[PDB]
Amino acid sequence: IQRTPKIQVYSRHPAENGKSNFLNCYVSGFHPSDIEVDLLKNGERIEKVEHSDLSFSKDWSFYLLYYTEFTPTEKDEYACRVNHVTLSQPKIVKWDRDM
Amino acid sequence: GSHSMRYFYTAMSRPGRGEPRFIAVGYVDDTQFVRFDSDAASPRTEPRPPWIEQEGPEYWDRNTQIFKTNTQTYRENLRIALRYYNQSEAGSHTWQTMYGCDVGPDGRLLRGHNQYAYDGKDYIALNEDLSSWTAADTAAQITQRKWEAAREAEQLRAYLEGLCVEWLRRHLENGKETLQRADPPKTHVTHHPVSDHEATLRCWALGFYPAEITLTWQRDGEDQTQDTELVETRPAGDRTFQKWAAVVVPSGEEQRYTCHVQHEGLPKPLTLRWEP
Amino acid sequence: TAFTIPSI
C-alpha cells in the first residue's frame, strides 16, 4: 500500500576540506513512486541538482539518486530535505562526514 | 561469473494531469544502458552507457517503436485493472513489470524472468519452466486464462531463449572493459568513541562493482548478526557502490572483533581489524 | 532487444 522512504546523505569520495567532491542523497524503499527531494547548504537549497532515472528493487519499492558537485569546507553545513505522501511533514537529514 | 540483461517498466496514472506516464529502463547486471520516458519532449530510446552508442539507426528505431506501443499497452492495463478491482477512474495507480534473461559463465541461457505487480503487490508471474503462470488473486486468474488461451507464454520464451540472450551476449562483448570486470572493494576499519566504556567500530568497503557484497562482524569468531548495524548498499555515482557495518564494543575488547568481507573481486575472503 | 508485452 504505502511505504515511507529511507534516506542516505554522503559523498562520492572521503571528505577533504578544500578539495572538491560530490554530494549524494539516496532515497530507497518507498512506494508509490511520486516523491520530492532537495539538497541544502546552510538551510538554503542548491539550484543545479541532477538525479537518476526511475527504477525499483525486487520488493518493488522505488529508488533514486540525487547528486551535486561541491567543495566540503570546515564550517559549511549540508543536508537533504525529503517529502513523501507517507510524511506528515518534510524530513531533513544532516550530512555526516563519517557516515 | 554469470551475467543478466534485465528490463524495468513503471506506469503511473494521474487523474486530470494527463495520460498515464510510462518509463522504461534497461540493464545488464548492475549497469544501466537505456532509458525511455513518455514524459520527455520528443520521446525516444536514449543511451545511458558508452558502449551501447555504437549501435546503428535500426536498433534505436525498432526499440523506440516497441516502447511507444508498450506505452499504449500499459494504459489499457490501468484502465482494465479498474474493472478487475472495482476501482474508480478518480484514483492513481502504479503498474510495475520486470522481465529478463540470466546467462551462465559460458554463454547459454541460465534462466528467464517475468513478474507483474499492481500498486506494489505481486499480480501474476511466469514460472521458471517458461510455460505456466502463478496468479496471486482472482483478478490475476482472469489475466492468466487469457494468456493461456493465446499461448502468450510461448511467445515470451521464444524471446527469452532467442533474442534476449543473443543480445545480452552482444552487449557484453562491446562492453568487455567494464561489464566483465570486477572492482574489489577498498576496505578498512574505523574507531569512534562514545562512552568511557563503549566505542564504535565501523567496517567500510568502498568503490566496488558489482554491488553484491557481504560485510560481517565477529566477536571471538562468533557472529554478531543481531548486534550489527548494516546500511543499505548505496551507489557511489562513478558506477561503484559503498556499504558499511558497525558494532558497539566495550573499551578494551576492541581487538576481540574481526570484520569479514566477500566480493567476487577478492580471490579469497578478507579479514580486517582495527589498526590503532 | 526488448519485448512487446501483451495487455493485462
Short mmCIF file of C-alpha atoms in Angstrom, two decimals:
data_model
loop_
_atom_site.label_atom_id
_atom_site.label_comp_id
_atom_site.label_asym_id
_atom_site.label_seq_id
_atom_site.Cartn_x
_atom_site.Cartn_y
_atom_site.Cartn_z
CA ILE A 1 0.00 0.00 0.00
CA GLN A 2 2.35 2.76 1.24
CA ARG A 3 5.97 2.77 2.32
CA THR A 4 7.92 5.75 3.67
CA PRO A 5 11.44 6.14 2.14
CA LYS A 6 14.82 5.51 3.71
CA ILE A 7 17.43 8.26 3.42
CA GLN A 8 21.21 8.40 2.93
CA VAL A 9 23.39 11.53 2.69
CA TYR A 10 27.09 11.14 1.92
CA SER A 11 29.83 11.91 -0.60
CA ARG A 12 31.38 10.14 -3.60
CA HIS A 13 34.92 10.30 -2.12
CA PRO A 14 36.09 10.83 1.52
CA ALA A 15 35.70 14.34 2.95
CA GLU A 16 38.65 16.67 2.38
CA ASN A 17 38.07 20.31 3.39
CA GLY A 18 39.26 22.27 0.39
CA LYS A 19 39.26 19.59 -2.30
CA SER A 20 36.12 19.28 -4.45
CA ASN A 21 33.74 16.31 -4.48
CA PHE A 22 30.14 15.18 -4.99
CA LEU A 23 27.19 15.28 -2.62
CA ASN A 24 24.83 12.30 -2.58
CA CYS A 25 21.33 11.76 -1.17
CA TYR A 26 19.86 8.31 -1.86
CA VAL A 27 16.15 7.61 -1.43
CA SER A 28 15.11 3.98 -1.33
CA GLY A 29 12.37 1.58 -0.29
CA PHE A 30 9.43 3.87 -1.00
CA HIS A 31 6.15 3.26 -2.80
CA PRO A 32 4.37 4.95 -4.66
CA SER A 33 6.98 6.49 -6.98
CA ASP A 34 5.88 10.11 -6.51
CA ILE A 35 8.45 11.96 -4.35
CA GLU A 36 10.27 15.34 -3.91
CA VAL A 37 13.95 15.82 -2.87
CA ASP A 38 16.14 18.86 -2.04
CA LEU A 39 19.88 19.25 -1.30
CA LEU A 40 20.65 22.03 1.23
CA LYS A 41 23.61 24.28 2.11
CA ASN A 42 23.09 26.10 5.41
CA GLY A 43 19.29 25.97 5.07
CA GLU A 44 19.23 27.27 1.50
CA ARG A 45 18.70 24.80 -1.35
CA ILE A 46 21.20 24.32 -4.19
CA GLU A 47 19.98 25.29 -7.67
CA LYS A 48 21.55 22.74 -10.01
CA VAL A 49 20.88 19.22 -8.80
CA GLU A 50 20.65 16.15 -11.06
CA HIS A 51 19.06 12.74 -10.48
CA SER A 52 18.83 9.14 -11.69
CA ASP A 53 16.15 7.52 -13.84
CA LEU A 54 13.31 5.83 -12.02
CA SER A 55 13.72 2.16 -11.18
CA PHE A 56 13.00 -0.33 -8.36
CA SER A 57 14.25 -3.32 -6.34
CA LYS A 58 12.75 -6.82 -6.18
CA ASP A 59 10.29 -5.90 -3.39
CA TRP A 60 9.08 -3.30 -5.87
CA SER A 61 9.95 -0.23 -3.79
CA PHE A 62 11.46 2.61 -5.84
CA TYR A 63 14.90 4.19 -5.63
CA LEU A 64 16.63 7.30 -6.91
CA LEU A 65 19.99 9.07 -6.65
CA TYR A 66 20.29 12.83 -6.26
CA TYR A 67 23.79 14.28 -6.66
CA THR A 68 25.54 17.66 -6.88
CA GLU A 69 29.16 18.81 -7.03
CA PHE A 70 30.51 20.68 -4.01
CA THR A 71 33.67 21.51 -2.05
CA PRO A 72 33.33 20.43 1.60
CA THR A 73 34.64 23.08 3.97
CA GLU A 74 35.21 23.38 7.70
CA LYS A 75 32.03 25.21 8.68
CA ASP A 76 29.65 24.67 5.74
CA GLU A 77 26.55 22.63 6.67
CA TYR A 78 24.69 20.33 4.27
CA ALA A 79 21.55 18.17 4.45
CA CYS A 80 18.77 16.50 2.44
CA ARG A 81 15.05 17.51 2.55
CA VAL A 82 12.61 14.78 1.51
CA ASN A 83 8.81 14.87 1.29
CA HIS A 84 6.52 11.93 0.57
CA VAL A 85 2.81 11.11 0.90
CA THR A 86 3.77 8.98 3.89
CA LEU A 87 5.13 12.12 5.56
CA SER A 88 3.01 14.45 7.67
CA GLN A 89 5.81 16.98 7.23
CA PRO A 90 9.12 17.18 5.26
CA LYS A 91 12.10 15.28 6.68
CA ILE A 92 15.61 16.77 6.91
CA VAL A 93 18.85 14.79 7.34
CA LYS A 94 22.25 16.36 8.09
CA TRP A 95 25.31 15.09 6.24
CA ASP A 96 27.94 13.44 8.45
CA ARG A 97 31.47 13.19 7.08
CA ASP A 98 31.66 9.87 8.93
CA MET A 99 28.57 8.05 7.67
CA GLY B 1 30.92 -15.00 -13.38
CA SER B 2 27.41 -15.17 -14.80
CA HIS B 3 25.52 -12.19 -16.25
CA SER B 4 21.99 -10.92 -16.84
CA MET B 5 20.13 -8.48 -19.06
CA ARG B 6 17.02 -7.02 -17.41
CA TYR B 7 14.12 -4.62 -18.12
CA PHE B 8 12.01 -2.43 -15.84
CA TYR B 9 8.70 -0.75 -16.74
CA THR B 10 6.75 1.59 -14.46
CA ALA B 11 3.40 3.19 -15.26
CA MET B 12 1.55 5.78 -13.13
CA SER B 13 -1.99 7.11 -13.61
CA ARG B 14 -2.68 10.77 -12.76
CA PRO B 15 -6.39 11.80 -12.82
CA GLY B 16 -6.53 15.19 -14.55
CA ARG B 17 -2.80 15.58 -15.02
CA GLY B 18 -2.70 13.81 -18.36
CA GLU B 19 -2.41 10.29 -19.75
CA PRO B 20 -0.55 7.79 -17.58
CA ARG B 21 3.23 8.09 -17.68
CA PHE B 22 5.49 5.22 -18.77
CA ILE B 23 9.23 4.97 -18.05
CA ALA B 24 11.37 2.08 -19.28
CA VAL B 25 14.99 1.35 -18.32
CA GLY B 26 17.31 -1.48 -19.37
CA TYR B 27 20.29 -3.00 -17.56
CA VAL B 28 22.98 -5.70 -17.93
CA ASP B 29 23.89 -6.71 -14.40
CA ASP B 30 24.19 -3.53 -12.25
CA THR B 31 24.86 -1.22 -15.20
CA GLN B 32 22.13 0.80 -16.98
CA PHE B 33 22.25 1.25 -20.74
CA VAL B 34 18.89 2.56 -21.98
CA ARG B 35 16.02 4.79 -20.94
CA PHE B 36 12.63 5.83 -22.34
CA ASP B 37 10.19 8.36 -20.97
CA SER B 38 6.78 9.13 -22.44
CA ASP B 39 7.04 12.41 -20.47
CA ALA B 40 10.03 13.82 -22.34
CA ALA B 41 9.76 16.47 -25.03
CA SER B 42 10.11 14.24 -28.08
CA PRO B 43 10.39 10.71 -26.53
CA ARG B 44 12.83 8.13 -27.95
CA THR B 45 15.12 5.43 -26.51
CA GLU B 46 18.28 7.14 -25.19
CA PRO B 47 21.69 5.65 -24.37
CA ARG B 48 22.99 5.66 -20.79
CA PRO B 49 26.39 3.77 -21.18
CA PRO B 50 29.13 4.50 -23.72
CA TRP B 51 29.31 1.08 -25.42
CA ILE B 52 25.63 0.92 -26.46
CA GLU B 53 26.12 4.02 -28.63
CA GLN B 54 27.84 2.07 -31.41
CA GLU B 55 24.52 0.51 -32.42
CA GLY B 56 23.04 1.72 -35.69
CA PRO B 57 19.84 3.60 -36.64
CA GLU B 58 17.68 0.49 -36.97
CA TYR B 59 18.34 -0.64 -33.39
CA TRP B 60 17.28 2.71 -31.97
CA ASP B 61 14.28 2.84 -34.27
CA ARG B 62 12.84 -0.65 -33.69
CA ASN B 63 13.24 -0.14 -29.95
CA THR B 64 11.58 3.29 -29.79
CA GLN B 65 8.66 1.74 -31.71
CA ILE B 66 8.33 -1.19 -29.29
CA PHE B 67 8.42 1.32 -26.44
CA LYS B 68 5.67 3.52 -27.93
CA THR B 69 3.35 0.55 -28.24
CA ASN B 70 4.16 -0.56 -24.68
CA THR B 71 3.03 2.91 -23.67
CA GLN B 72 -0.38 2.25 -25.11
CA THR B 73 -0.31 -1.34 -23.76
CA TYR B 74 0.06 -0.27 -20.11
CA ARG B 75 -2.52 2.47 -20.48
CA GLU B 76 -5.19 -0.14 -21.33
CA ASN B 77 -3.86 -2.00 -18.29
CA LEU B 78 -4.51 0.81 -15.86
CA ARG B 79 -8.00 1.01 -17.41
CA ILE B 80 -8.65 -2.72 -17.32
CA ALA B 81 -7.21 -3.03 -13.79
CA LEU B 82 -10.08 -0.83 -12.62
CA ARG B 83 -12.72 -3.39 -13.61
CA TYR B 84 -10.70 -6.26 -12.10
CA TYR B 85 -10.70 -4.50 -8.72
CA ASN B 86 -13.83 -2.34 -8.85
CA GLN B 87 -11.75 0.83 -8.61
CA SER B 88 -12.81 4.35 -9.70
CA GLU B 89 -11.40 6.44 -12.54
CA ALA B 90 -10.53 9.13 -9.95
CA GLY B 91 -7.62 7.44 -8.20
CA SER B 92 -3.99 6.98 -9.23
CA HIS B 93 -2.45 3.52 -9.68
CA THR B 94 1.06 2.28 -10.47
CA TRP B 95 1.84 -0.74 -12.67
CA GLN B 96 5.24 -2.49 -12.41
CA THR B 97 6.82 -5.14 -14.62
CA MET B 98 10.12 -6.89 -14.82
CA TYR B 99 11.47 -9.34 -17.36
CA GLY B 100 14.86 -10.61 -18.45
CA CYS B 101 17.26 -13.46 -19.09
CA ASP B 102 20.20 -14.65 -16.99
CA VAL B 103 23.12 -16.24 -18.84
CA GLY B 104 25.76 -18.55 -17.41
CA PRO B 105 29.57 -18.25 -17.23
CA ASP B 106 29.82 -19.95 -20.62
CA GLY B 107 27.15 -18.34 -22.78
CA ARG B 108 23.97 -20.45 -22.71
CA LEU B 109 20.66 -19.42 -21.12
CA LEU B 110 20.68 -19.96 -17.35
CA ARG B 111 17.12 -18.82 -16.56
CA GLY B 112 14.32 -16.47 -17.59
CA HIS B 113 12.13 -13.92 -15.80
CA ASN B 114 8.75 -12.08 -15.90
CA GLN B 115 6.65 -10.78 -12.98
CA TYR B 116 3.96 -8.14 -12.60
CA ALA B 117 2.83 -6.01 -9.70
CA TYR B 118 -0.14 -3.72 -9.16
CA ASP B 119 0.43 -1.00 -6.58
CA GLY B 120 3.39 -2.89 -5.13
CA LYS B 121 1.55 -6.20 -4.77
CA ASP B 122 2.52 -9.22 -6.82
CA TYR B 123 -0.06 -9.84 -9.56
CA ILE B 124 1.00 -12.70 -11.89
CA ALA B 125 4.32 -14.31 -12.88
CA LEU B 126 5.56 -16.79 -15.47
CA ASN B 127 7.27 -19.75 -13.82
CA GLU B 128 10.92 -20.71 -14.34
CA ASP B 129 9.72 -23.50 -16.67
CA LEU B 130 8.73 -20.63 -19.02
CA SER B 131 5.35 -22.22 -19.82
CA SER B 132 2.89 -21.66 -16.97
CA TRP B 133 1.77 -18.85 -14.70
CA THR B 134 1.37 -18.17 -11.00
CA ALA B 135 -1.52 -15.83 -10.12
CA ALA B 136 -1.86 -14.07 -6.76
CA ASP B 137 -5.62 -13.29 -6.71
CA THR B 138 -8.82 -13.99 -8.66
CA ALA B 139 -8.15 -10.92 -10.78
CA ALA B 140 -4.80 -12.32 -11.85
CA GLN B 141 -6.51 -15.56 -12.85
CA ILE B 142 -8.61 -13.63 -15.35
CA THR B 143 -5.35 -12.43 -16.86
CA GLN B 144 -3.93 -15.96 -16.79
CA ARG B 145 -6.55 -17.78 -18.87
CA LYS B 146 -6.22 -15.00 -21.43
CA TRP B 147 -2.50 -15.62 -21.68
CA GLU B 148 -3.01 -19.39 -21.58
CA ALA B 149 -5.69 -19.10 -24.25
CA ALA B 150 -3.43 -17.04 -26.53
CA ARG B 151 -0.32 -19.14 -25.96
CA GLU B 152 1.30 -15.94 -24.71
CA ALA B 153 3.70 -17.98 -22.58
CA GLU B 154 5.34 -19.43 -25.72
CA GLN B 155 5.96 -16.01 -27.28
CA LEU B 156 7.81 -14.81 -24.21
CA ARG B 157 10.02 -17.92 -24.22
CA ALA B 158 10.92 -17.75 -27.91
CA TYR B 159 12.24 -14.30 -26.93
CA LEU B 160 13.90 -15.11 -23.61
CA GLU B 161 15.66 -18.08 -25.26
CA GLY B 162 16.38 -16.29 -28.55
CA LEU B 163 16.57 -12.51 -28.90
CA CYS B 164 17.12 -11.70 -25.23
CA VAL B 165 20.20 -13.94 -24.82
CA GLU B 166 21.58 -13.29 -28.30
CA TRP B 167 21.78 -9.62 -27.31
CA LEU B 168 22.97 -9.99 -23.75
CA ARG B 169 25.93 -11.74 -25.41
CA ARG B 170 26.50 -8.98 -27.91
CA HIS B 171 26.02 -6.17 -25.37
CA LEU B 172 28.66 -7.92 -23.28
CA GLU B 173 31.30 -8.09 -25.97
CA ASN B 174 31.12 -4.41 -26.88
CA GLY B 175 31.42 -3.69 -23.16
CA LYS B 176 34.24 -6.05 -22.13
CA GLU B 177 36.41 -3.40 -20.48
CA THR B 178 33.77 -2.71 -17.80
CA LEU B 179 30.79 -5.08 -17.84
CA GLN B 180 33.13 -8.07 -17.45
CA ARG B 181 35.44 -6.52 -14.83
CA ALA B 182 35.11 -6.74 -11.09
CA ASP B 183 36.43 -3.93 -8.92
CA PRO B 184 37.15 -5.39 -5.45
CA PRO B 185 36.34 -3.05 -2.56
CA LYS B 186 38.86 -0.94 -0.71
CA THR B 187 38.34 -1.87 2.93
CA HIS B 188 39.37 -0.51 6.34
CA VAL B 189 38.10 -0.30 9.97
CA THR B 190 37.49 2.91 11.93
CA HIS B 191 37.19 3.80 15.59
CA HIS B 192 34.65 6.20 17.17
CA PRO B 193 34.47 6.60 20.99
CA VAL B 194 31.06 7.04 22.63
CA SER B 195 31.25 6.45 26.37
CA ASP B 196 34.25 5.94 28.67
CA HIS B 197 33.22 2.24 28.48
CA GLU B 198 31.88 1.87 24.94
CA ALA B 199 33.10 2.51 21.40
CA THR B 200 32.01 2.10 17.77
CA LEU B 201 33.85 0.05 15.16
CA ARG B 202 32.83 0.80 11.57
CA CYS B 203 33.93 -1.51 8.77
CA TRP B 204 33.93 0.11 5.32
CA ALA B 205 34.04 -1.15 1.74
CA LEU B 206 34.18 1.49 -1.00
CA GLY B 207 34.32 1.80 -4.78
CA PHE B 208 33.21 -1.68 -5.74
CA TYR B 209 31.35 -3.33 -8.64
CA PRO B 210 29.18 -5.28 -8.94
CA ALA B 211 27.10 -4.18 -5.92
CA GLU B 212 26.62 -7.68 -4.47
CA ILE B 213 28.77 -7.78 -1.35
CA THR B 214 28.91 -9.22 2.19
CA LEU B 215 30.24 -7.48 5.32
CA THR B 216 30.12 -9.38 8.64
CA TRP B 217 31.38 -8.74 12.18
CA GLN B 218 32.59 -11.31 14.72
CA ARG B 219 33.34 -11.37 18.40
CA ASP B 220 35.76 -14.19 19.24
CA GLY B 221 34.86 -15.91 15.98
CA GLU B 222 31.11 -15.94 16.68
CA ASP B 223 28.66 -13.93 14.55
CA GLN B 224 27.15 -10.67 15.76
CA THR B 225 24.21 -10.64 13.39
CA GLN B 226 21.58 -9.32 15.80
CA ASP B 227 24.05 -6.70 17.17
CA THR B 228 25.45 -5.41 13.84
CA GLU B 229 24.03 -2.33 12.16
CA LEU B 230 24.11 -2.65 8.36
CA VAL B 231 23.34 0.20 5.96
CA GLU B 232 21.68 -0.47 2.63
CA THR B 233 24.12 -0.69 -0.27
CA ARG B 234 24.20 2.81 -1.81
CA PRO B 235 25.54 3.92 -5.24
CA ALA B 236 28.81 5.94 -5.35
CA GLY B 237 28.00 7.72 -8.61
CA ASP B 238 31.09 6.62 -10.54
CA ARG B 239 29.41 3.24 -11.15
CA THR B 240 30.75 1.61 -7.98
CA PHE B 241 28.94 1.15 -4.67
CA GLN B 242 29.50 1.51 -0.94
CA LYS B 243 28.48 -0.28 2.26
CA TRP B 244 29.30 -0.35 5.94
CA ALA B 245 28.71 -2.35 9.10
CA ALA B 246 29.00 -1.27 12.71
CA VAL B 247 29.11 -2.78 16.16
CA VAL B 248 29.48 -1.14 19.58
CA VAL B 249 32.21 -2.62 21.75
CA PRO B 250 33.40 -2.10 25.35
CA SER B 251 36.58 -0.01 25.82
CA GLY B 252 39.41 -2.56 25.79
CA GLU B 253 38.00 -5.58 23.95
CA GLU B 254 38.11 -3.91 20.53
CA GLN B 255 40.75 -6.41 19.46
CA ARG B 256 38.29 -9.23 20.10
CA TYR B 257 36.44 -8.15 16.96
CA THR B 258 37.05 -9.02 13.31
CA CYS B 259 35.33 -7.83 10.15
CA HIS B 260 34.89 -10.24 7.20
CA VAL B 261 34.46 -9.32 3.56
CA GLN B 262 33.49 -11.17 0.42
CA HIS B 263 33.13 -9.85 -3.11
CA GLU B 264 33.89 -11.52 -6.42
CA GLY B 265 36.76 -9.08 -6.92
CA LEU B 266 38.51 -10.76 -3.99
CA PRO B 267 40.37 -14.05 -4.69
CA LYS B 268 39.96 -15.20 -1.12
CA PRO B 269 37.72 -13.61 1.50
CA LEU B 270 39.22 -10.88 3.71
CA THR B 271 39.61 -10.31 7.43
CA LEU B 272 40.25 -6.85 8.91
CA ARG B 273 40.61 -5.41 12.38
CA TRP B 274 41.24 -2.06 13.97
CA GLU B 275 44.81 -0.87 13.41
CA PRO B 276 45.44 1.76 16.11
CA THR C 1 16.29 -6.13 -27.88
CA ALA C 2 13.01 -5.51 -26.00
CA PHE C 3 9.74 -7.40 -25.78
CA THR C 4 6.30 -6.30 -26.88
CA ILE C 5 4.29 -7.18 -23.80
CA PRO C 6 0.59 -8.22 -24.07
CA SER C 7 -2.14 -6.31 -22.26
CA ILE C 8 -3.39 -7.41 -18.86
#
